[PDB]
Amino acid sequence: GRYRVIHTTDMGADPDDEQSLVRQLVMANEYDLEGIITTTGCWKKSTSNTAYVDRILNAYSQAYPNLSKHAEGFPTPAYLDSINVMGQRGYGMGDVGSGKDSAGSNLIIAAVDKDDPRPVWATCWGGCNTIAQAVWKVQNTRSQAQLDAFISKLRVYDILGQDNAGTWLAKNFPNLIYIRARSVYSWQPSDSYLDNHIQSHGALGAVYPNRRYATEGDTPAFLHMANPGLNDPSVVSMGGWGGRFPSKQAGVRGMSCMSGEDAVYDTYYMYTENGESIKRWSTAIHNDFQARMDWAIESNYSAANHHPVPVVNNDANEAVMYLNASAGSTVSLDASGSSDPDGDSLNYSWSHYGEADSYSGSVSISNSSSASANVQIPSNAGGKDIHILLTLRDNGSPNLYAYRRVVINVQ
Numbered sequence: 001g002r003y004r005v006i007h008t009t010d011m012g013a014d015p016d017d018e019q020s021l022v023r024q025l026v027m028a029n030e031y032d033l034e035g036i037i038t039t040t041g042c043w044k045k046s047t048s049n050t051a052y053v054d055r056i057l058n059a060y061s062q063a064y065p066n067l068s069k070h071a072e073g074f075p076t077p078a079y080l081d082s083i084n085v086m087g088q089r090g091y092g093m094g095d096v097g098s099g100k101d102s103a104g105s106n107l108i109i110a111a112v113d114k115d116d117p118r119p120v121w122a123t124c125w126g127g128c129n130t131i132a133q134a135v136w137k138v139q140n141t142r143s144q145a146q147l148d149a150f151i152s153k154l155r156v157y158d159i160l161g162q163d164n165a166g167t168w169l170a171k172n173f174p175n176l177i178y179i180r181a182r183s184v185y186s187w188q189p190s191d192s193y194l195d196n197h198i199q200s201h202g203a204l205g206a207v208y209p210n211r212r213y214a215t216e217g218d219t220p221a222f223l224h225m226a227n228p229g230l231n232d233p234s235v236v237s238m239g240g241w242g243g244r245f246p247s248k249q250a251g252v253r254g255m256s257c258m259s260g261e262d263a264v265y266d267t268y269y270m271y272t273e274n275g276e277s278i279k280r281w282s283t284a285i286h287n288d289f290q291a292r293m294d295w296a297i298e299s300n301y302s303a304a305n306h307h308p309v310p311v312v313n314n315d316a317n318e319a320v321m322y323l324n325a326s327a328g329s330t331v332s333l334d335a336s337g338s339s340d341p342d343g344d345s346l347n348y349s350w351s352h353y354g355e356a357d358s359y360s361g362s363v364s365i366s367n368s369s370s371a372s373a374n375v376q377i378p379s380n381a382g383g384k385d386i387h388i389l390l391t392l393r394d395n396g397s398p399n400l401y402a403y404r405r406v407v408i409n410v411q
């Protein structure tokens with residue numbers, strides 16, 4: 001019920017990285033976070049220490065006693081300290097190669113090598129060169145088969161393209177699942193929301209800085225993995241809080257601080273959006289962070305809201321649900337069972353996520369605002385899939401959401 005994620009971040013380039021780390025930390029019970037790596041990108045080409053992260057983790061240690069009363073599985077402060085390390089200290093592929101290992105690059109290697117069947121995500125909040133150093137070292141020291149196996153267990157989520165090393169990865173390792181997300185600017189909350197709901201809330205709020213340019217431009221790089229019941233982030237066409245990536249595109253260019261650098265790698269492909277795809281989730285996203293900052297400052301469970309818990313057809317697993325059904329049949333999807341741990345009331349909303357599925361037509365859902373819905377599988381849907389989403393919403397303060405996607409493979 002959790003995904004494995006390692007973040008690499010160019011702390012100091014812009015306050016948004018700090019903002020993003022605060023949100024990730026109050027969401028950390030939903031993940032297996034395995035690295036917080038301070039590194040570079042074209043907006044911050046040199047770095048020397050982890051002091052930004054140290055400061056934020058000190059705040060986390062003050063919030064952790066409260067956070068841990070609100071959900072299971074928050075990582076300990078000691079554990080987070082252990083995975084707070086330096087990555088590459090210089091820029092791009094110019095800091096990749098012989099003698100250039102970092103704590104962060106080695107951390108990535110060790111995570112990918114681990115005997116956990118789950119893949120691991122490595123992200124680029126700045127450049128991707130700490131990931132590139134890891135892959136370069138594996139390529140330089142292991143067999144082809146061992147390199148292919150390594151690549152098969154990795155995924156990269158690159159925000160915007162901020163060094164030439166991400167491009168080097170996409171070009172040289174075409175079997176690596178690689179997203180270069182660019183439509184990361186349309187979902188953000190207001191500065192007043194931040195002041196009132198976030199920054200005022202205790203020690204973690206005090207290390208959440210104001211926006212300089214954009215708020216939390218890098219945050220999609222973990223929201224992609226926030227909701228196992230909504231989306232499998234390795235199926236990048238599904239859509240979810242990190243966006244929807246329907247195809248690979250050629251020559252996806254990075255930011256202006258690396259102009260001219262991508263082109264030497266042509267032709268290369270990267271998954272990227274074909275349409276902004278985060279804003280649709282914004283209400284849920286904003287309410288989520290609001291409630292979690294309440295968790296951070298309330299010592300009593302009773303004093304904050306917690307997410308509702310979906311069940312569909314007596315299946316309580318926090319994962320995408322897969323069903324096979326015949327064309328021209330009706331499928332009952334019953335979310336009775338679902339619960340709320342605060343005793344809130346629930347609202348049920350069923351939708352056809354037609355952007356995400358291979359069926360080209362429309363799909364009728366009866367009683368789509370009720371717990372117990374019925375999906376009409378078209379007679380012409382054979383050989384396609386149909387994605388049906390349950391969105392569950394409580395009436396707590398603020399309203400919190402939960403999801404279950406049902407993927408119906410039609411015969």
Ligand SMILES: [Ca+2]
Nearest residue numbers: 017125126218
């Ligand atoms: Ca950044």
Ligand SMILES: [Ca+2]
Nearest residue numbers: 306342394396
């Ligand atoms: Ca609730």
Ligand SMILES: [Cl-]
Nearest residue numbers: 183184185186
């Ligand atoms: Cl955007």
Ligand SMILES: [Cl-]
Nearest residue numbers: 239244277355
């Ligand atoms: Cl979408």
Ligand SMILES: [Mg+2]
Nearest residue numbers: 200202205206
């Ligand atoms: Mg404060």
Ligand SMILES: [Mg+2]
Nearest residue numbers: 239240243277
């Ligand atoms: Mg989406």
Ligand SMILES: [Mg+2]
Nearest residue numbers: 354357358359
């Ligand atoms: Mg469709």
Ligand SMILES: [Zn+2]
Nearest residue numbers: 197290293294
């Ligand atoms: Zn609050």
